[PDB]
Design a protein around this ligand. Structure first.
Ligand SMILES: Nc1ncnc2c1ncn2[C@@H]1O[C@@H]2COP(=O)(O)O[C@H]2[C@H]1O
Lengths: 214, 216
């Protein structure tokens, strides 16, 4: 779907015809659930745009667990930074569900802006505006306690993958209890202990297959 | 002269086409909120970049020395300065404005590739800090900060590399984003273990491997 692809942030503020000029040259790839798209340390020089599915972004923790950095879904990009500043990947990307995704490397990008200087300028604008959002995001997070930080992070994920259902956010998933444990990168006991606590304060109503967030 | 080459913009000569200025100690290059237009690359000296917390307290973001660049956001996303830039010590730097930079780009689109690298890299580092803030403990973060300061301002001195940063133990606490009480406990803990030596504005990192094993 061209619309899904065109919603990517790398296309924000770009002429639909220049977006299309790039899109047409890209063929979708099929990734199975639990598939490692790229691991930390591996050379990184391409970005992915998701059409369907969810992808986990994470880094290695001292104990050997993988910290849930973020979760990207449809229209979302991952690995986009390596297109501008390539090199060894500082994070890993792993499919949470079955994914269909589009890829593009630096050559593609350079060949794309090769004829379209207007795009370099807009990319700077979008990237720089994104840095300002991420900056005061950090600022906001710094001046908050430990639990408050994690809460904020989870809230942002809810706001992104949740449907507005009467002053609340519904996030419907198709994951088994073990997959949810793999997603967070924590014990299955630690997860259920945390979910039990959030529910206790009325922040979470846990129904089968879905979660209702305040 | 060789310092300019290490700058992010030129880290990718045709660069010789490169306004030099000298600032004194404690000089405020720009203030948080002022109209933001200029760009700055440091040749010699150190500059504190900070942003006020919601409570008014001045909070330290990053410390930058030679070959480092600050105030770039003002050129691409024009508007108020999001932060304040203060010179810790005497500083010699070169500046540029949006209209001056946009001209060099019109002539050579090659820089657009280097400019994007710099932004994309700042963006990545801010994302790493966000992950550290959540997944890395206070002592872990403290060690990680010292190790990052050593990469930029570290000179070997006998067995331990002396890392001069000219920062207060409270200013470090701001970099890490934790209470000064918890940060001080972490610093003393490292000192008592023989990992580091506290020298006022300087730190002697005796055991680098331990710190590295404490930051992961
Ligand atoms: N999940 C899907 N199932 C079936 N058809 C689809 C799906 N996603 C996209 N398409 C079709 O593929 C087309 C791609 O271009 P359009 O987005 O214009 O319109 C899209 C639909 O016709």
């Amino acid at each position: 779907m061209d619309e899904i692809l065109a919603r990517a942030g790398i296309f924000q503020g770009v002429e639909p015809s220049a977006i299309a000029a790039l899109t047409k040259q890209l063929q979708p790839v099929d990734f199975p659930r639990g598939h490692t798209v790229f691991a930390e340390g591996e050379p990184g020089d391409r970005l992915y745009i998701i059409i369907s599915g969810k992808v986990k972004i994470g880094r290695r923790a001292p104990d050997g667990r993988e910290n849930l950095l973020t979760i990207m879904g449809p229209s979302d990009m991952f690995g986009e930074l390596s297109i501008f500043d390539p090199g060894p990947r500082t994070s890993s990307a792993t499919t949470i569900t079955e994914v269909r995704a589009v890829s593009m490397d630096r050559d593609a990008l350079r060949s794309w802006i090769a004829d379209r200087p207007e795009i370099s300028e807009q990319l700077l604008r979008v990237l720089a505006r994104r840095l300002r959002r991420t900056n005061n995001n950090l600022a906001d997070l710094i001046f908050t306690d430990v639990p408050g930080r994690v809460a904020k992070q989870l809230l942002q994920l809810a706001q992104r993958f949740g449907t507005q259902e009467g002053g609340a956010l519904r996030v419907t998933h198709d994951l088994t209890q073990e997959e949810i444990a793999q997603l967070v990168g924590a014990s299955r006991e630690t997860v259920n202990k945390a979910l039990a606590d959030f529910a206790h304060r009325g922040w979470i109503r846990l129904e089968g297959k879905s979660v209702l967030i305040s």
